[PDB]
């Protein structure tokens, strides 16, 4: 039996006993959606040649304009903006957004995949809103999930109950619910990371990497992909298994995803689906941010692969 | 002043004085294009899943393209990734000329939304004899014509003839496929080197050599990106925006390579060299490799001119 | 700011603190609504045409289908169906829904407007469903409406709050709130219906027409038009002013029309936006159906001018 | 085997030899109709409405116009949007005339109805520099006309010497499919369209035959009635379901009330290429020479005996 990203939502809201509000965050996010998706397939790009005689711009005026208007945030993070965005009390409700509006859009010129990340926070202090109510660890994630505007259109949304996947019907402008209580593989034969920067590894990559080249159990070698978007490797990931990487180099010692609306999203959305994700240090869900645009190095994706890691970086201490 | 491709397509035939066969070649393809792209986009996917209480993308796209060309009476031989012979064209629809596409490039690894792509390469049947198998056995120098559409974030058509390499965006508000980059040109030397690397282990060593010295520069230059879609459409289009190489040789377990030389590596190599690229399978230019078979496989390195030469060298130390 | 139906139905819903089954169920039937324009609009016909080598049922089956499995419903009844449909027990809701799935699709063939009617019933009694439970009169509406298929797809949702037109983007699948709380007007200059059966028209009728050409005053006589589609013809009376008639004959003593899911909508539309609607001897909304598919002749529009008829129909009774 | 209107209408070229600058005007022509098609069903429309934070004849003209003149086919561009005929910039200037109405009916778009394009094509006949006068042809000299209805779906049809082609247009690709080819128009319908609004204005003819519709006297069955008040509408309606369309003069309009060069003209060629006829009453609307761009004209069209049944009770009026 068919179902909706927003019939289904509104199905759980209900059997919770919620007031509502969660379930018009994310149906006004689902508008944001289907616009930018719309115009990354270029619907209009005539009118701009003259038919008739930017794209990371309007993608995050669309979120941060239908968040405003849910009446269901506060605060709102975007990569786009460098201090967080502090809803006016006439539209303040309880919840916290931060969102890459479309990640991976630096190399857009190329097509290549694009995507929209967001993490969503209930507002914990009776305080007046501000910034500092974005500085939570991703323990604290009510919802989180990402866009993908790859070959289609496809929103994962990861909650509680677990992660579903619900493709885009351009014809009549729905979210098709397609994968249900998705689990990702135990073990994959995927590894994605930019080896570009294979002079600065740490040593625990340099190994790791050498071993998925060089099995030492005789098994085959790991297949590399890459596409250098952030949200099209991590759904390759979650969907035929493997491993992720963007590990600290020298021009990023921290490594150079976003922890706020790149990594806590991501993390959460693998540890849903039976993944994992780490910084090497630590979970990365554990990570008590200082800063809205603070960095961190990830790792993420099927159980096995990470935990290989964790043991190869275990071993330099 | 707009341009579509259409219409682009239309003025230069008439300049040229020809019959209007290619240009309904050209008018046929795009639409089959259009309808591959919405089907991958998933229009109509709420139907499949019960909203009211079918064939997979690669064989509808095949479906697509061989029903519009056959029906565009330019035609006479078709090959396609997805047969095992050629088609002939039934008499009273022949036309003049030979194509060779993979309709659905990548769409093995479609389940993770990866970009896809087609390809496709026009040739002018040379023979006088009954159209066969054999008219598409003719090198990639003796190209009229060839391109890709990407179905990536947007939809693009990329199509090279003699005059140069066009790009064309699909605008699908209203179907019609946008003039938005004219006479291309790729970077001399670019920053980026694409190529599967988990298989390193039975790299020849000559593609060992170029790829450590991207990864540590002997010159104290600075090492170069990696980017690895898996899809050559995707691959290729970015090596022509943003310059750069894109390597899939042979090695001792893949004599020949593995990508086919009549639809994926001549159409490619048709591009790059339009565009001021290289394209090689180390030994020779891909476009004058010789076919014997239509499905025969062919190493290729391409991309920016300085960075092929520069892998050349390479492969010629290894003599 | 900006809204959609499905935000704007949901803000109304929390406010009025109910269940949430109602707008689960006309969030259901928008999506069938987006599916019927996108195949009215004619996508996808090329595959029709062999490009690779039935609409009145085919909006039958979605309205249906996604009002079945909002468990919103209990009892269905359509145009289509010679008896009412029972909802599966494991999915039975609490409303009674009466529709016209494609009205006017019989003159198709000339691309001229169609549309979809439905009419919303709460289930009043505790008994097992049959099809007595969508024999109530029009005035136990809870929500009534109509998608015009015309030059673009609007929808047209009244309730006790008023009546409300969103008009659908189909570059995002979302309907946009076009026109708040409308009104129609209390005199209008156009009057509508097939006068080509003029020679079988109640003597009333004749007359009132006639005045309408011929205006025993010095005013200028009405225009005339007739689409001949429904939904197409009141929404013209609704947003111009003016009068449409389909009334009783000698030939035909209830009318022509449908009660339960063409007039009753109908009538419920034109009386929330201050218009009125009578069969000539009392409103529409009044009249007590003993059969599902039963006839009620039927005269609406701006009050002026169905109180003119009225007039005129007395003179003659 | 499927066909669409480009590679129909390139087949047709390469048969009769032609230069290919036709096919070129009706290629840029149906990429118009696309865009105004998109905006006519209000895509993008939730923009407007400050998602992110022209009216549509204007836009429509604005379409036409601009897609025409970068088509290097035309010369003189008539349209019912601007007050003066447009002259294209030499550089830009083909062989032909377009006469145009580029959303006709969209007095009434407020309610939905359906609007439509309709467009009269002619070859340039005089040598003089180009200039107004070489819009004033008769309609019997048009080489190409026909129309786009925006109703249910969007469909156009394409009249020429070779006949009535209807082409559906596919929004999931953006193509004009072949849908009816050679259309003829049924000898005697069932149902008259005219504004009985005015009534009162009619001459004795409209009066009669109006009157022989609703009670005939062979006791046959009446007509139905119809009227959207659009004519892209209406006219389609009676191509597809036979019957007669009128708008004649009444005392607001003494000349009638459509206007010949892009609205009257063109559907007269699209009925006549049909099978059917339509007349002004005194002579065939094609007959007509115009001396304005602008000027109206009465019309009565449809199927042959409908038109002709209509003659002969203009002609008992003498
Ligand atoms: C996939 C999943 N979704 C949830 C979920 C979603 C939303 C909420 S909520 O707090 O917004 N409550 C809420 O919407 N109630 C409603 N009343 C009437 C209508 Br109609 S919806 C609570 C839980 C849990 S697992
Ligand atoms: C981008 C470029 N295109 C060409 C090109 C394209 C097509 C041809 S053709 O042989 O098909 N001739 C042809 O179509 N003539 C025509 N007559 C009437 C019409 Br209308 S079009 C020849 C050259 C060269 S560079
Ligand atoms: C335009 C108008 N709509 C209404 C209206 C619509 C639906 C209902 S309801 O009974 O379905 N309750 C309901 O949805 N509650 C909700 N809780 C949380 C969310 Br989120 S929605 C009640 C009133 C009145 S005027
Ligand atoms: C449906 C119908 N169309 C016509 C028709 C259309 C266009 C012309 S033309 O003068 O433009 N010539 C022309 O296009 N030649 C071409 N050669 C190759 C290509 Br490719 S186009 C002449 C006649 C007649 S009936």
């Given at each position: 039996?068919?179902?909706?990203?927003?019939?289904?939502?509104?199905?759980?809201?209900?059997?919770?006993?919620?007031?509502?509000?969660?379930?018009?965050?994310?149906?006004?996010?689902?508008?944001?959606?289907?616009?930018?998706?719309?115009?990354?397939?270029?619907?209009?790009?005539?009118?701009?040649?003259?038919?008739?005689?930017?794209?990371?711009?309007?993608?995050?005026?669309?979120?941060?304009?239908?968040?405003?208007?849910?009446?269901?945030?506060?605060?709102?993070?975007?990569?786009?903006?460098?201090?967080?965005?502090?809803?006016?009390?006439?539209?303040?409700?309880?919840?916290?957004?931060?969102?890459?509006?479309?990640?991976?859009?630096?190399?857009?010129?190329?097509?290549?995949?694009?995507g929209?990340i967001?993490?969503?926070?209930?507002?914990?202090?009776?305080?007046?809103?501000?910034?500092?109510?974005?500085?939570?660890?991703?323990?604290?994630?009510?919802?989180?999930?990402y866009?993908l505007?790859?070959?289609?259109?496809?929103?994962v949304?990861?909650?509680?109950?677990?992660?579903?996947?619900?493709?885009?019907?351009?014809?009549?402008?729905?979210?098709?619910?397609?994968?249900?209580?998705?689990?990702?593989?135990?073990?994959?034969?995927?590894?994605s990371?930019?080896?570009?920067?294979?002079?600065?590894?740490?040593?625990?990559?340099?190994?790791?990497?050498?071993?998925?080249?060089?099995?030492?159990?005789?098994?085959?070698?790991?297949?590399?992909?890459?596409?250098?978007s952030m949200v099209a490797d991590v759904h390759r990931t979650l969907?035929?298994?493997?491993?992720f990487?963007?590990?600290?180099?020298?021009?990023?010692?921290?490594?150079?995803?976003?922890?706020?609306?790149e990594?806590?999203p991501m993390?959460?959305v693998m540890?849903?689906?039976?993944?994992?994700a780490?910084?090497?240090?630590?979970?990365?869900?554990?990570?008590?941010?200082?800063?809205?645009?603070?960095?961190?190095?990830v790792?993420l994706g099927?159980?096995?692969?990470?935990?290989?890691?964790?043991?190869?970086?275990?071993?330099?201490?």
């Open positions: 039996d068919v179902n909706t990203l927003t019939r289904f939502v509104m199905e759980e809201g209900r059997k919770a006993r919620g007031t509502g509000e969660l379930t018009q965050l994310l149906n006004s996010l689902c508008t944001a959606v289907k616009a930018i998706s719309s115009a990354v397939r270029k619907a209009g790009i005539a009118h701009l040649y003259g038919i008739a005689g930017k794209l990371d711009v309007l993608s995050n005026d669309l979120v941060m304009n239908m968040l405003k208007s849910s009446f269901a945030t506060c605060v709102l993070v975007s990569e786009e903006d460098k201090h967080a965005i502090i809803v006016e009390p006439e539209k303040r409700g309880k919840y916290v957004v931060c969102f890459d509006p479309l990640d991976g859009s630096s190399n857009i010129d190329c097509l290549v995949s694009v929209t967001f993490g969503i926070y209930r507002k914990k202090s009776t305080d007046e809103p501000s910034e500092k109510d974005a500085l939570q660890p991703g323990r604290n994630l009510v919802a989180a999930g866009a505007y790859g070959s289609a259109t496809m929103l949304l990861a909650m509680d109950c677990g992660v579903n996947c619900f493709m885009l019907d351009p014809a009549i402008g729905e979210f098709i619910l397609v994968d249900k209580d998705v689990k990702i593989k135990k073990k994959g034969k995927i590894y990371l930019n080896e570009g920067y294979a002079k600065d590894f740490d040593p625990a990559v340099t190994e790791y990497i050498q071993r998925k080249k060089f099995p030492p159990d005789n098994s085959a070698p790991y297949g590399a992909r890459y596409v250098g969907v035929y298994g493997g491993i990487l963007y590990p600290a180099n020298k021009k990023s010692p921290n490594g150079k995803l976003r922890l706020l609306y990594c806590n993390a959460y540890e849903k689906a039976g993944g994992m780490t910084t090497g240090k630590e979970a990365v869900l554990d990570v008590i941010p200082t800063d809205i645009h603070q960095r961190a190095p790792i099927s159980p096995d692969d990470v935990l290989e890691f964790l043991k190869v970086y275990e071993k330099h201490s």
